């Protein structure tokens, strides 16, 4: 499945990335 | 170079999405990737929230962003992600 694509699509990634992987230990 | 605004921007949203997608698709609230939990919970924060976009809680927003702008490219109508197979209703 095309999950990956250029960041031209997507707006500021800033949030979900932290939700993807922040460091909670 | 691969992507210079972001191979790191992209790859980071790509992961955001892959996590998100996974988190969408993964239905194990005790998957313990709590970071999977989390993304999932983010989807799930988002949807149990309606202030997501309406108010301005952009987890969902950057998740709608994430999900939709994802959606926009994952041609699928059926399994995991928030606005993915709901934006993807054509």
Swiss-Prot record, chain A:
Gene that specifies this protein: TP53
Changes after translation: Deacetylation by SIRT2 impairs its ability to induce transcription activation in a AKT-dependent manner. Lactylation by AARS1 prevents ability to undergo liquid-liquid phase separation (LLPS), thereby inhibiting transcription factor activity.
Record: disease: TP53 is found in increased amounts in a wide variety of transformed cells. TP53 is frequently mutated or inactivated in about 60% of cancers. TP53 defects are found in Barrett metaplasia a condition in which the normally stratified squamous epithelium of the lower esophagus is replaced by a metaplastic columnar epithelium. The condition develops as a complication in approximately 10% of patients with chronic gastroesophageal reflux disease and predisposes to the development of esophageal adenocarcinoma. Esophageal cancer: A malignancy of the esophagus. The most common types are esophageal squamous cell carcinoma and adenocarcinoma. Cancer of the esophagus remains a devastating disease because it is usually not detected until it has progressed to an advanced incurable stage.
Effect the entry attributes to changing residue 22 to K: In sporadic cancers; somatic mutation
Reported effect, residue 10 to T: In a sporadic cancer; somatic mutation
Superkingdom to which the source organism belongs: Eukaryota
Family of the protein in this entry: Belongs to the p53 family.
Name by which UniProt lists this protein: Cellular tumor antigen p53
Portion of the full sequence shown: 35 to 59 of 393
Swiss-Prot record, chain B:
Phosphoserine modified-residue sites: 4
UniProt-annotated location(s): Cytoplasm; Nucleus; Chromosome
Zinc finger (TAZ-type): 6-87
Post-translational modification: Acetylated on Lys at up to 17 positions by intermolecular autocatalysis. Sumoylated; sumoylation in the transcriptional repression domain (CRD1) mediates transcriptional repression. Desumoylated by SENP3 through the removal of SUMO2 and SUMO3.
Top-level taxon of the source organism: Eukaryota
Domain notes from UniProt: The CRD1 domain (cell cycle regulatory domain 1) mediates transcriptional repression of a subset of p300 responsive genes; it can be de-repressed by CDKN1A/p21WAF1 at least at some promoters. It contains sumoylation and acetylation sites and the same lysine residues may be targeted for the respective modifications. It is proposed that deacetylation by SIRT1 allows sumoylation leading to suppressed activity.
Disorder named in the UniProt entry: Defects in EP300 may play a role in epithelial cancer.
Function description: Functions as a histone acetyltransferase and regulates transcription via chromatin remodeling. Acetylates all four core histones in nucleosomes. Histone acetylation gives an epigenetic tag for transcriptional activation. Mediates acetylation of histone H3 at 'Lys-122' (H3K122ac), a modification that localizes at the surface of the histone octamer and stimulates transcription, possibly by promoting nucleosome instability. Mediates acetylation of histone H3 at 'Lys-18' and 'Lys-27' (H3K18ac and H3K27ac, respectively). (Microbial infection) In case of HIV-1 infection, it is recruited by the viral protein Tat. Regulates Tat's transactivating activity and may help inducing chromatin remodeling of proviral genes. Binds to and may be involved in the transforming capacity of the adenovirus E1A protein.
Protein name, per record: Histone acetyltransferase p300
Species this protein is from: Homo sapiens
Gene behind the chain: EP300
Residues of the full protein shown: 1723 to 1812 of 2414
